[PDB]
Design a binder for this molecule. Structure first.
Ligand SMILES: NC(=O)CC[C@H](N)C(=O)NS(=O)(=O)OC[C@H]1O[C@@H](n2cnc3c(N)ncnc32)[C@H](O)[C@@H]1O
Length: 529
RNA sequence: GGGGUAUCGCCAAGCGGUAAGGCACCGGAUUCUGAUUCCGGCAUUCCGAGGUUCGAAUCCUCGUACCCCAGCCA
């Protein structure tokens, strides 16, 4: 339960409503991010819990900013998250003829007029945060004049910016939004839904409330920056002949540490090619998190955990990581893979190889076991072997022995370095029957795997606050390593995450993994202290 | 100027009856993943200062910090 649900409950109780109807109204001007998922879980989540409906409306009132590629990705992400919308996908465009008629009503009611104030002039007349604005010299045109002018506008008789339809409210209002807000503006641009049928388009504030009313929304849930806007929202509905009046409620938006959360900034990363694309695994986008290896479930849990309030907030990366770790820890089958390989040949080994038993999950034997090949020539992580120090160091020491995961106990006795001093191979000896722990991969039965290690996209906790957020990008956000994995991963498919032993959770796809060279994204490493 | 928010490192319950929970952090027990699990600990005070009441994070007063609004964007 949260404050929004309490209002809903109170309404149901008081009999103000008998059903709940919400909506998720994104603008198709970019892809969705973890922030939009908060909105998605709030709106769709509420609807299904109260046995109600929730629409997926595309607020497409600004053609020049929107694109068809975006509507498709938004639809994909919502479905991927596991939510279904009521009826067909709605579009603000669907109400264009309707909005137009309503504007005409306002005009006949003397509550809207066509303004000739240039785009610069309108601001000059608008006033400031401390000084009231002033009435336009065109504000008193007759109803007939405005009617003609609006049609002139619609008919495309005016050039872009040469005129606009504004609401006649109060230029001396403390709410800057109520100072004769523009209802319509001229844009001779093709619309992705209505083609070139329109040259004038409705503004967000005029559109949004009427869209909600027509769809019969009971609770329009948006973020805090629209609190001022509610005044206009209510003004519009209170001044037109519309049978319902949905109520707007605002909750604080999500902010994630080390990443930016605005389509504007995210779009810049894509446009400047600083990331592969919107779906890049470093991106805080849904598709990006998806390609990164995050489960829709883990994301819904995150939204559940972060809550819904009116307090500004910035969630730490550790919270999101905990969610995906919880899920994957419980479901992802374990395996063997080496990021920094160094050959470790057991000189004590006779033959070509054998096959050992390994649980698909150590704490869950019901998940089964597999048969992984063992040999005299294996691969191990360079971070596992050390000729020196600390009693705490549980891994392979130059004078000690270490248990190989689900296998025998080796014991390094001789190492082989090179000209720069780098070790090429570690000669060891295995115990006949012995079945610190370390993972490994048989050199003979080894699958050439490309491993991509991701990290925080930005060097600072609040990159959005940087003067040039781009200059603070982490150069090590992506570190492509080449390693070896057990032959099992040969049959690994994109979509499933395997937990590489002692390294983290990984998954195929990467948008690069082929048949010869499989690419694996590190969804997230394991907890290490 | 108007609109909002102040509770642990980060989130968040709380709605006159005596500070939940999560993430995180500090200990101890297990583990063939330094993982998992696992028991034990972690705000005598809620932005500050007065006031009210038997009792206040909750009510009252004055202050303070931060966030949003001057697109023909959403
Ligand atoms: N009344 C409204 O919600 C405005 C609708 C507008 N088309 C709009 O905001 N479009 S949008 O594409 O920008 O986003 C759609 C929804 O997502 C919410 N949102 C956007 N960023 C968010 C964030 N960081 N955290 C939480 N919610 C966030 C918007 O409020 C909107 O409901």
């Amino acid at each position: 339960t949260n404050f929004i649900r309490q209002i809903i409950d109170e309404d149901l109780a008081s009999g103000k409503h008998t059903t709940v109807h919400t909506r998720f109204p994104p603008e198709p001007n970019g892809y969705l991010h973890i922030g939009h998922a908060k909105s998605i879980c709030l709106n769709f989540g509420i609807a299904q819990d109260y046995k109600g409906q929730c629409n997926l409306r595309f607020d497409d009132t600004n053609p020049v900013k929107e694109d068809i590629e975006y509507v498709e990705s938004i639809k994909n992400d919502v479905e991927w998250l596991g939510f279904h919308w009521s009826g067909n996908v709605r579009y603000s465009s669907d109400y264009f003829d309707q909005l137009h008629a309503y504007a005409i009503e306002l005009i006949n009611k003397g509550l809207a007029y066509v303004d000739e104030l240039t785009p610069e002039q309108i601001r000059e007349y608008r006033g400031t945060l401390t000084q009231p604005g002033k009435n336009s010299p065109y504000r008193d045109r007759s109803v007939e004049e405005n009617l003609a002018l609006f049609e002139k506008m619609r008919a495309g008789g005016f050039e872009e910016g040469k005129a606009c339809l504004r609401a006649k409210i109060d230029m001396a209002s403390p709410f800057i939004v109520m100072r004769d807000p523009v209802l319509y503006r001229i844009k001779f641009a093709e619309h992705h839904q209505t083609g070139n049928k329109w040259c004038i388009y409705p503004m967000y504030d005029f559109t949004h409330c009427i869209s909600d009313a027509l769809e019969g929304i009971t609770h329009s849930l948006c973020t805090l920056e629209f609190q001022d806007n509610r005044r206009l929202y209510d003004w519009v509905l209170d001044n037109i002949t519309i049978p319902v009046h949905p109520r707007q409620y605002e909750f604080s938006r999500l902010n994630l540490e080390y990443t930016v959360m605005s389509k504007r900034k995210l779009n810049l990363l894509v446009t400047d090619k600083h990331v592969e694309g919107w779906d890049d695994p470093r991106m805080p986008t849904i598709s990006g998190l998806r390609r990164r290896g995050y489960t829709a479930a883990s994301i819904r849990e995150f939204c559940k955990r972060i809550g819904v309030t009116k307090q500004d907030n910035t969630i730490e990366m550790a919270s999101l990581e905990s969610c995906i770790r919880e899920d994957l820890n419980e479901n992802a089958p374990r395996a063997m893979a080496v990021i920094d390989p160094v050959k470790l040949v057991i000189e004590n080994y006779q033959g070509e190889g054998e096959m050992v038993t390994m649980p698909n999950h150590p704490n869950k034997p019901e998940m089964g076991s597999r048969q992984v090949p063992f040999s005299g020539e294996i691969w191990i992580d360079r971070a596992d072997f050390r000729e020196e120090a600390n009693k705490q160091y549980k891994r392979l020491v130059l004078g000690k022995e270490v248990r190989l995961r689900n296998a025998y106990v080796i014991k390094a006795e001789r190492v082989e370095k090179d000209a720069e001093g780098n070790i090429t191979t570690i000669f060891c000896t295995y115990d006949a029957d012995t079945l610190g722990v370390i993972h490994w991969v048989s050199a003979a039965h080894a699958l050439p795997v490309e491993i991509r290690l991701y990290d925080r996209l930005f060097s600072v906790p609040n990159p959005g606050a940087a003067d040039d957020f781009l200059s603070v990008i982490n150069p090590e956000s992506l570190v492509i390593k080449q390693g070896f994995a057990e032959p099992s991963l040969k049959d690994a498919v994109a979509g499933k995450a395997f937990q590489f032993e002692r390294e983290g959770y990984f998954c195929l796809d990467s948008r690069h993994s082929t048949a010869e060279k499989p690419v694996f994204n590190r969804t997230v490493g394991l907890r290490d202290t």
